[PDB]
Amino acid sequence: FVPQKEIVYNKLLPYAERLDAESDLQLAQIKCNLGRAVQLQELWPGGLFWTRKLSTYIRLYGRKFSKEDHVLFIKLLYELVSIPKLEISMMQGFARLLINLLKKKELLSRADLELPWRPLYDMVERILYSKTEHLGLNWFPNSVENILKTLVKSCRPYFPADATAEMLEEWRPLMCPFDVTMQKAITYFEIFLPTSLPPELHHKGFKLWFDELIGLWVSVQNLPQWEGQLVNLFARLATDNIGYIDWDPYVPKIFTRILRSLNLPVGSSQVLVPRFLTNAYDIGHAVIWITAMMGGPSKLVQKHLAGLFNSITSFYHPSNNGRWLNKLMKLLQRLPNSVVRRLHRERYKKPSWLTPVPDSHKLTDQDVTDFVQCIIQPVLLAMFSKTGSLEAAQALQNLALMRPELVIPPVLERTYPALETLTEPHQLTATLSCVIGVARSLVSGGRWFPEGPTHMLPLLMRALPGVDPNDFSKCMITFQFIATFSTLVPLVDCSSVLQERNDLTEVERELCSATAEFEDFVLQFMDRCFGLIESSTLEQTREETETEKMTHLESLVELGLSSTFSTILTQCSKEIFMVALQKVFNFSTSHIFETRVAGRMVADMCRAAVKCCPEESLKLFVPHCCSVITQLTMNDDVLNDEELDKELLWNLQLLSEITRVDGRKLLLYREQLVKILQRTLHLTCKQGYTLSCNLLHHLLRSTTLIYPTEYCSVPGGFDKPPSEYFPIKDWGKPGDLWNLGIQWHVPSSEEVSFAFYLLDSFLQPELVKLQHCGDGKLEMSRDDILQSLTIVHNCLIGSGNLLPPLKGEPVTNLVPSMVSLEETKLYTGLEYDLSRENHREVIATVIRKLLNHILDNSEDDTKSLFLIIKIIGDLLQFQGSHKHEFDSRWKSFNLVKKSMENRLHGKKQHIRALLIDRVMLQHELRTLTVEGCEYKKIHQDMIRDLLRLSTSSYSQVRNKAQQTFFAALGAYNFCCRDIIPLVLEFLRPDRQGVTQQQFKGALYCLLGNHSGVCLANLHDWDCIVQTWPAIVSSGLSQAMSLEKPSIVRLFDDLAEKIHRQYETIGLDFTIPKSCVEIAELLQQSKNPSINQILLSPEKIKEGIKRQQEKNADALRNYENLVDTLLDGVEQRNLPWKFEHIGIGLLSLLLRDDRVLPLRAIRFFVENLNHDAIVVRKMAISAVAGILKQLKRTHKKLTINPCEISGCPDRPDNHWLHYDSKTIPRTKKEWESSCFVEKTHWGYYTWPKNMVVYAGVEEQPKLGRSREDMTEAEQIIFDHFSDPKFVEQLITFLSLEDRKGKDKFNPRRFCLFKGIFRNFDDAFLPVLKPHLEHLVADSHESTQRCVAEIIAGLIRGSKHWTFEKVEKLWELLCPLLRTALSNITVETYNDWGACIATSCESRDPRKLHWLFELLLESPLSGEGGSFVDACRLYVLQGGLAQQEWRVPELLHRLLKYLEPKLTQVYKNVRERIGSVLTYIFMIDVSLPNTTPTISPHVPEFTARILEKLKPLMTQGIKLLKTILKWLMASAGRSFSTAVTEQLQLLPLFFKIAPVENDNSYDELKRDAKLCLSLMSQGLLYPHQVPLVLQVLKQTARSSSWHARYTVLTYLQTMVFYNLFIFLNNEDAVKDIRWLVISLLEDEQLEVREMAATTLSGLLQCNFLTMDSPMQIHFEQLCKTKLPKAELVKRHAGVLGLGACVLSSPYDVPTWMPQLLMNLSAHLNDPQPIEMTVKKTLSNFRRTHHDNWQEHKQQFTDDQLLVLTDLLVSPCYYA
Ligand SMILES: O=P(O)(O)O[C@H]1[C@H](OP(=O)(O)O)[C@@H](OP(=O)(O)O)[C@H](OP(=O)(O)OP(=O)(O)O)[C@H](OP(=O)(O)OP(=O)(O)O)[C@@H]1OP(=O)(O)O
Ligand SMILES: O=P(O)(O)O[C@H]1[C@H](OP(=O)(O)O)[C@@H](OP(=O)(O)O)[C@H](OP(=O)(O)O)[C@@H](OP(=O)(O)O)[C@H]1OP(=O)(O)O
Secondary structure (H helix, E strand, C coil): CCCCCEEECCCCCHHHHHCCCHHHHHHHHHHHHHHHHHHHHCCCCCHHHHHHHHHHHHHHHHHCHHHHHHHHHHHHHHEEEEEEEHHHHHHHHHHHHHHHCCCHHHHCCCCCCCCHHHHHHHHHHHCCCCCCCCCCCEEEEEECCHHHHHHHHHHHHHCCCCCCCCCCCCCCCHCCCCCCCCHHHHHHHCCCCCCCCCCHHHHHHHHHHHHHHHHHHHCCCCCCCCCCHHHHHHHHHHHCCCCCCCCCCCCCHHHHHHHHHCCCCCCCCCCCCCCHHCCCHHHHHHHHHHHCCCCCCCCCHHHHHHHHCCCCCCHCCCCCCCHHHHHHHHHHEEEEEEEHHHHHHCCCCCCCCCCCCCCCCCHHHHHHHHEEEEEEEHHHHHHHHHCCHHHHHHHHHHHHCCCCCCCHHHHCCCHHHHHHCCCHHHHHHHHHEEEEEEHHHHHHCCCCCCCHHHHHHHHHHHHHHCCCCCCHHHHHHHHHHHHCCCCCEEEECCCCCCCCCCCCHHHHHHHHHHHHHHHHHHHHHHHHHHHHHCCCCCCCCCCCCCCCCHHHHEEEEEEEEHHHHHCCCCCCCCHHHHHHHHHHHHHHHCCCCCCCCCCHHHHHHHHHEEECHHHHHHHHHHHHHHHHHHHHHCCCCCCCCCCCCCCHHHHHHHHCCCCCCHHHHHHHHHHHHEEEEHHHCEEECCCCCCCHHHHHHHHHHCCCCCCCCCCCCCCCCCCCCCCCHHHHHHCCCCCCCCCCCCCCCCCCCCHHHHHCCCCCCHHHHHHHHHHHCCCCCCCHHHHHHHEEEHHHHHHHHCHHHHCCCCCCCCCCCCCCCCCCCCCCCCCCCCCCCCCCCHHHHHHHHHHHHHHHHHHHHHHCHHHHHHHHHHHHHHCCCCCCCCCCCHHHHHHHHHHHCCCCCCCCCCHHHHHHHHHHHHHHHHHHHHHHHCCCCCCCCCHHHHHHHHHHHHCCCCHHHHHHHHHHHHHHCCCCCCCCCCCCHHHHHCCCCCCCCHHHHHHHHHHHHHCCCCCCCCCCCCCCCHHHHHHHHHHHHHCCCCCCCCCCCCHHHHHHHHHHHHHHHCCCCCCCCCCCCCCCHHHHCCCCCCCCCCCCCCCCCCCHHHHHHHHHHHHHHHHHHHHHHHHHHHHHHHHCCHHHHHHCHHHHHCCCCCCCCCCCCCHHHHHHCCCCCCCHHHHHHHHHHHHHHHHCCCCCCCCCCCCCCCCCCCEEEECCHHHHHHHCCCCCCCCCCCCCCCCCCCCCCCCCCCCCCCEECCCCCCCCCCCCCCCCCCCCCCCCCHHHHCCCHHHHHHHHCCCCCCCCCCCCCCHHHHHHHHHHHHHCCCCCHHHHHHHHHHHHCCCHHHHHHHHHHHHHHHHHHHCHHHHHHHHHHHCCCCCCHHHHHCCCCCCCCHCCCCCCCCCCCCCCCCCCCCCHHCCCCCCCCCCCHHHHHHHHHHHHHHHHHCCCCCCCHHHHHHHHHHHCCCCCCCCHHHHHHHHHHCCCCCCCCCCCCCCCCCHHHHHHHHHHHHHCCCCCCHHHHHHHHHHHHHCCCCCCCCCCCCCCCCCHHHHCCCCCCCCCCCCCCHHHHHHHHHHHHHHCCCCCCCCHHHHHHHHHHHCCCCCHHHHHHHHHHHCCCCCCCCHHCCCCCHHHHHHHHHHCCCCCCCHHHHHHHHHHHHHHHCCCCCCCCCCCHHHHHHHHHCCCCCCHHHHHHHHHHHHHHHHCCCCCCCCCCCHHHHHHHHCCCCCCCCCHHHHHHHHHHHHHHHHCCHHHHHHHCCHHHHHHHHHCCCCCCCCCC
């Protein structure tokens, strides 16, 4: 038996008694056939048909199986995605299911399930880091990167406990921080490392790697691509292991980089902008990482949040918007969203095997109060931003779940002045948006904020002018405002409870007296909405046309008034209803509205009046409307007409859109509705019958659908028990899911026999007229058929719940299967006895005769053909609900649910009006979940009749028919195999008469033009072997008008959809022997498994035999697809545009598991010399992949690195010396040298198996001829030996594809890499002239051509014998010396990526000929100076790519440059500075490292100071190389400030100018923006005594330029390091000394920057405004002036003014005092007089935003001082 693990919302559903017998029968059919599909070696029909059906079963019944059945499903799905080398598209199909079984962690414990991880790594590395799939060998899906990560994430908490040191042993040797192989490891660490381990396993957890990898993270100070992965790792480590990390030693380093990742402009020049900060921290991962730190006993992370926001409050102000605001609004959206989820995780979540937080690490009531109080001031400034109020109201909702008494009064103090202002209208858009998130916490008066619903009704009454027909932004947010209040509070009078009753409290009796205005709200809501309608009627201005479409902005106001009025009028007492029903009736019947805009809009407002009480409302509408239709239609002969009377034509829509109340209470009016349908449905006016068809439609909709009738917040309703319960208690009703009290409308036999009586009196008389017209015996008009089809369409679409689909079962051509392919059946509650009529089959036979008559006898009747598409679109796939209306109510539910949800305590607070709709969304999901559908013989005919309409004469008819055609291809099982042979019949050359509409209509059938089914690019060989040749066979002969421009865009879209969507198809579906799990799932499940067969004696041999036949035909159809394309591209009289598609389909077939067939190897090699540049650009990309296929598999062996190097920790070990190329380079005995090819090996640690290549000649033989050769696949040898082929190949490659966009092609490189690797310079004597001719040419086309061949020689010379290596460089070392001599402007990026490419993954031993040539003379300039710079830039990329493997050549190049760097030019200085950052990149100071052999920054900079000692003319020449180096080592080094470089700062301050203008020298201009890059760089917290010693020394007394720039250094250096300094509390006393002691400067320009610095430090709360600060200024202002004393008195006026400018948007308690005595220095002398005039005029500028709130902090005696005061500039005097 099954104890269900987790189910759904189906208990409530009305047919809940039948959801156990139907669910368990499908689950038993899952266990049978999914086990039998795997065990009978079948994945093409059957492995996917029951993976989809379990994917359907999870999305329909929750889990609803047992724990033993849940580990059978996981361990079957896991072993299928971990098959070695599957088909990768079906690997995702098993993947998304296997994510769904595992994403709910609480369902399966750790002791109940375990999964290995190395099957995931071979799965990931083949799909994510494939060594193919850039040469054209594999073709992956587009979604493969994120599905595999979210699968490992779902499999990660079930990895075994001994399998993370097993995981820290494999990629820990990849952590050399210089190669690209480190972010290989760090992305594996973020994905694979187990962090959600139980607390008895942390020693086998993060403690193996935490201090090893947080110590790496704190030591970088660049921003690599892998630093953003560790913040995604450490966040996930933090959020699971709360209370087991001590983040306190690392918390100032964490918040200083979250601040730094905001990238805030600070300093009034503020940037020599580092472009390395493109990569940064995803703050959405940082919010996860702050939130998991807060609950500690020492509240240390809390004040770093208060230090964070208070430093950035001025950026949330709505005047200060900029680039930073998108990260900064996103920070407010997520931190209250995440603190609440942590509070739900520790207060209301049920326990599971996931470890809870400890009691010591849990958020206290103080801790969440102090979180709101440090975020409330930035969220209220975000409320009024220019970018909207969406991010603030989502923040303000989640803050209101925690502390309502602290967050709701600061909002409603700004809301009441916003609803009555008539000036600053933006608040009403933004304050109302924020009360809607507040609304759940506002109407619910808790034990802290009980005054909430006192503000309910006055905000609700003052919002009534918001419904105005002038704004629509106010009107939508007003309709959203009142509907979100009038679904919380019942609108009931409370006066009979206002008598003697002791239940009312002080606040609750204040509510009941205010409920006298509930009727006055609803009636004034209507008188405001009637003017909203009657002033929005449609004006017919243009006399020719008729605007019939309600626009999108007006369709929202219909639905916005259909929502916001039906929610008032449901949440409403019956006494207030019926006095408001008459206001609707006395409006909508005394007027005559235009039926287009105001017709849909009045009748929807009446539709709301009927759906709330259908008895009392239908007593007066349908007697009124039917008595006036029969008066105004059947009196005269208005059956035949041209235009109806606008009142008759009104009262149909007033009746049609009103008769869709609950269909039980329409049986009273049977003999009135049928009477008008028998009189106005057969009219002549094209709007007259469509309003009558909408009447017939909605009557059938109301009498066969299951839907809820009421949507009230209380299940009894607000009307049926008056005064039995007190209504003002259920205002904050949480609306429980159990005992919901939902009321349904299941169709009775009275409502069903009437549903067929309308169908037996209007469908059948409209079907016999269509029958005799399609037979030739009635001959109706063109509009008479059009009128009759609407009756057939509105009876089908509208009563389709009663009509069974089809019968007939087409077989014998589809896919045969060994297992069941039965269609699923879901009882959506109705029987539909299926004995009497079956009306759906009759319509399908009338149409196939009617459509056969119309397409032959009248091909021009378009509007009849549009209806036939609408009926076949509903004869096939229409049960009771619509496939698009469900998707728009699914989105409208998540728009309403996610808006008003109590995230603090779980599912128990969703309101009843949401939950009733979601149960209806569960019924409507079951009405559309037709997963399996058997392709029957009627479905073989109805789609082929759509295929005639998809190819017909008119493009309006073809476009509508193809969309039904494509939707009908996705529904039925194996239809696409039936219809490809039928749709390609319009594309054959041999066809006699095929029109151009016939032709291109069939190519819009192939080009799917949607997201559902691409019919030319299916994922099967039996379909692709027909569609791809037929595209290339078209063209050469067809009726293919290639001169029409639309058909050329069609083939360019049909070819560009194939290359975008194609994904490589498997050839071997060999299910491995490790699927005993399938036998363990078929057998012995038995708890739901009612399937007693359990047999497979020799059917498993038949399944193996049919699989090997599938494996044979998939191999056969592949090699037939190659032959049919080559017979179509080498076809005579093709157009050119059809062979580029034909080569384009051959480039996708080049496979890795196979070798391409012989005629295609001959093809792509011979098409390397093609005249079309597009073809031979593809032949380069294909022959490079052929040479990968023909690779000859070198042998390997394993090195113990203790055996070599003589003896047995992160860099440059003692047992690592053989990897470093200095002296012992191989000259004669080249073998026995242990060449380690790739760079990163052996840096950090050594792997378990360090693997190098073999010795001499154990690799395969190199020099060979055609005798010992594969005699079928090296015809490529025959072409590169022919000198006519080579001389034409060298000639085509030296063309110019473009002059600007012409770079070193990395795909011509892989062409020549695969040549000289595979053939071992058998072609190099045939390329003797064509290498020596191209180097001696001035053209950049040939220098680029030769460079791909040069680097392809070098990286092809990996496995060459020592004879061939020396014979290579004997002609190659003079060849590069020629090329490096004649290097040009358009060539040094080619050579800069030529020999920097050739040093990629080679040992520095094996290429010393470069490193003796490239380091020979880079700056000994034989010709020019730009040549010497380009000769040095190519040296840079080669030495950087062999990063740590060489200490020696870095010294030999540093020893070369250390005399030369003084006497060079600027283009060489910009290279030497770019080279010296790679000479010193190895000096890293990483946490467990060793001082490397590679040259040191401290050993070099001490020599630089020895040469700059006369400065502290030839030293100023040396600064232009040091400054250009310190510009390059800004973010391009692993430690941005070595302490010997820090005293280069006082030499830079006296040079860097003040104004920073373009008129200064290059020494000055490069010294100013070198200080900007060092201040904006980080620093370790043991450098705060070291840099502050420098800046106190530099600003002590040197020169006023240096005192100025120390201040502008500080302001953008204690901000980007703001929490390093605030941890070292001795440093903030030294900043406060230096800034204040430099207000006393002898230079005025220094001291005003000292006050600008101090004003910002006070503003970011780096310096608290203590009392001895103000005593130091207030006892400095009162200073006598006898005539040094002037500068002494001024510095107090700077100091008072610095405090004034420090709070620009608030007036604190200290603020009015130090404005009054600040204003007393206004008649002071002139240096003081400017400053007081600058400070007060800047005060008044920033304080006119909300000065009415600022003036209350002033006395009335002090307002007369500040208002009447002169601070005006010179041009007012
Ligand atoms: O069916 P939908 O629309 O796709 O949405 C499902 C979600 O998708 P899924 O069912 O897995 O496909 C699933 O969320 P995730 O698995 O992704 O986390 C459920 O979460 P869960 O219940 O496990 O988690 P908890 O209860 O929130 O802790 C439900 O989310 P809540 O409302 O928060 O959950 P409640 O249903 O209210 O209990 C939600 O049910 P609704 O239909 O009402 O939106
Ligand atoms: O010398 P490289 O240009 O750096 O290329 C090598 C080379 O691949 P090619 O056959 O394309 O030249 C290796 O092949 P072998 O010498 O071992 O025959 C291959 O090794 P595998 O075939 O075992 O994959 C290795 O790949 P890897 O670094 O994953 O070991 C790959 O290096 P790249 O992937 O960086 O190109």
